[PDB]
Amino acid sequence: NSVYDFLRYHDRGDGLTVNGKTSYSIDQAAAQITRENVSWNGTNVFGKSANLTFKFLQSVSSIPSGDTGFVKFNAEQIEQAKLSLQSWSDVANLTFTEVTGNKSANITFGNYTRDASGNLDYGTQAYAYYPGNYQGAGSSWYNYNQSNIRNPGSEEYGRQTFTHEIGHALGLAHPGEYNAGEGDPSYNDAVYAEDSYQFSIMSYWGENETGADYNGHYGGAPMIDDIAAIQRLYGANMTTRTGDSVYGFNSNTDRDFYTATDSSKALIFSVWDAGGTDTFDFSGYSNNQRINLNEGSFSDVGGLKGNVSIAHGVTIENAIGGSGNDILVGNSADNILQGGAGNDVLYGGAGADTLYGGAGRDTFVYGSGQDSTVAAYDWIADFQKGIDKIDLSAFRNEGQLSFVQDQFTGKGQEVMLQWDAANSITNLWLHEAGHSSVDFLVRIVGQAAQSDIIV
Ligand SMILES: [Ca+2]
Ligand SMILES: [Ca+2]
Ligand SMILES: [Ca+2]
Ligand SMILES: [Ca+2]
Ligand SMILES: [Ca+2]
Ligand SMILES: [Ca+2]
Ligand SMILES: [Ca+2]
Ligand SMILES: [Zn+2]
Numbered sequence: 320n321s322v323y324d325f326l327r328y329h330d331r332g333d334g335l336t337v338n339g340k341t342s343y344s345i346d347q348a349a350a351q352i353t354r355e356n357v358s359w360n361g362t363n364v365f366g367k368s369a370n371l372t373f374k375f376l377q378s379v380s381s382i383p384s385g386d387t388g389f390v391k392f393n394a395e396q397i398e399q400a401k402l403s404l405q406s407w408s409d410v411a412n413l414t415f416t417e418v419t420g421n422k423s424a425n426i427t428f429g430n431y432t433r434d435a436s437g438n439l440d441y442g443t444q445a446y447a448y449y450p451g452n453y454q455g456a457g458s459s460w461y462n463y464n465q466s467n468i469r470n471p472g473s474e475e476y477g478r479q480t481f482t483h484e485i486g487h488a489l490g491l492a493h494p495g496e497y498n499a500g501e502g503d504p505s506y507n508d509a510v511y512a513e514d515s516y517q518f519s520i521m522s523y524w525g526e527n528e529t530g531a532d533y534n535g536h537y538g539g540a541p542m543i544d545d546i547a548a549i550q551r552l553y554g555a556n557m558t559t560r561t562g563d564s565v566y567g568f569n570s571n572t573d574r575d576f577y578t579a580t581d582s583s584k585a586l587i588f589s590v591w592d593a594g595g596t597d598t599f600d601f602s603g604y605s606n607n608q609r610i611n612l613n614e615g616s617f618s619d620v621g622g623l624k625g626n627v628s629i630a631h632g633v634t635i636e637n638a639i640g641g642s643g644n645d646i647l648v649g650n651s652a653d654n655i656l657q658g659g660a661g662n663d664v665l666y667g668g669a670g671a672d673t674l675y676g677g678a679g680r681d682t683f684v685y686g687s688g689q690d691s692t693v694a695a696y697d698w699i700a701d702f703q704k705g706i707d708k709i710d711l712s713a714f715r716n717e718g719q720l721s722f723v724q725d726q727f728t729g730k731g732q733e734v735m736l737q738w739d740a741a742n743s744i745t746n747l748w749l750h751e752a753g754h755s756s757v758d759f760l761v762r763i764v765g766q767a768a769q770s771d772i773i774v
Pocket of ligand 6: 676678679681703706
């Protein structure tokens with residue numbers, strides 16, 4: 320039943336209540352984040368692309384906030400800021416072009432170090448201005464007295480702050496009515512339950528407020544609701560990673576937040592992918608992981624909780640677990656699932672899936688007849704007789720499954736294992752109640768015993 324619960328991991332909307340707060344769906348959160356109804360295309364303009372310019376100020380006549388002690392961006396800030404911009408243009412129909420000299424720009428970057436009174440400010444972090452035609456519109460500012468701001472490449476909060484402020488400069492607002500300086504807001508003030516770093520980088524609250532746990536890390540890229548929100552304003556970018564993309568270990572994304580170079584690296588991201596056959600490669604971790612390929616769902620990767628999610632409108636096809644005891648849940652597409660070492664639970668779901676339990680005592684689960692129809696049957700390519708198991712207990716709801724040796728009686732709800740000596744393939748047939756013909760089939764590359772089947 321671990322599959323059942325995991326499938327409902329972090330359910331939202333549908334009149335639910337989480338943490339005593341109203342639960343919002345991705346779109347409701349996205350609408351809330353774009354409530355200011357402002358973008359670089361104007362007010363109340365949705366689904367329209369934009370070609371924007373950005374500039375690293377070398378000097379200023381004044382900072383629109385009144386803050387003083389201007390300091391230009393250093394090399395590392397410049398590189399990290401470009402990565403943040405890229406994480407936004409990757410998902411929304413936006414293009415960023417740098418301008419220098421006297422040319423004006425839609426989005427600007429600059430640091431400050433003192434307040435209007437001329438006193439050192441080592442307490443604040445950063446802020447930005449919404450798009451518009453007013454003086455300073457789209458400008459973003461950061462406190463140079465903060466080490467995370469000076470070293471955004473080594474201090475994760477810095478990079479996250481860049482992405483956050485750029486979010487404002489693009490038209491995104493905090494999930495709720497609250498802002499630094501104004502009193503002392505908290506998650507208790509959140510308009511909806513999903514107002515945390517787990518769903519939006521535009522939030523003020525840690526992922527822990529929603530049950531997630533990134534072990535002190537900060538994802539520096541747009542999360543699931545941020546993606547929906549930014550696309551609501553500028554449209555989705557359908558040209559991003561349209562080939563076969565691999566996320567996690569052995570990544571070919573050339574994106575730091577989608578890449579893990581070794582087991583000690585933390586992964587925190589919401590994936591946007593516009594095409595191809597893709598893979599969630601989390602093979603380098605030894606932690607027990609829970610991987611869900613359903614769009615909009617969250618996964619527990621590398622020892623963290625709720626650190627990985629799939630954006631709405633995205634189809635990820637494959638997943639590879641680690642040496643831990645994992646749970647891999649596929650989607651309606653044809654998935655290739657690899658559990659790796661450890662005792663894993665694989666659930667292909669709808670579609671013709673190919674499953675590899677890997678080393679260990681693995682379990683291949685089937686929740687219904689639609690999971691492996693004859694017209695699009697599953698393949699279990701490395702089944703180990705007497706070690707792995709095939710769970711068909713879900714069929715009990717319509718009558719306890721009975722085993723038959725070489726013939727079906729017709730009473731339905733019977734399971735048969737057929738050995739193909741010539742090809743060394745075992746065909747698992749299931750004649751379901753209500754079905755006039757045998758419509759369930761799982762082909763197995765290897766031998767299987769009646770005692771390997773759970774009914
Ligand atoms: Ca892809
Ligand atoms: Ca895909
Ligand atoms: Ca495993
Ligand atoms: Ca599937
Ligand atoms: Ca395994
Ligand atoms: Ca196995
Ligand atoms: Ca299937
Ligand atoms: Zn903010």
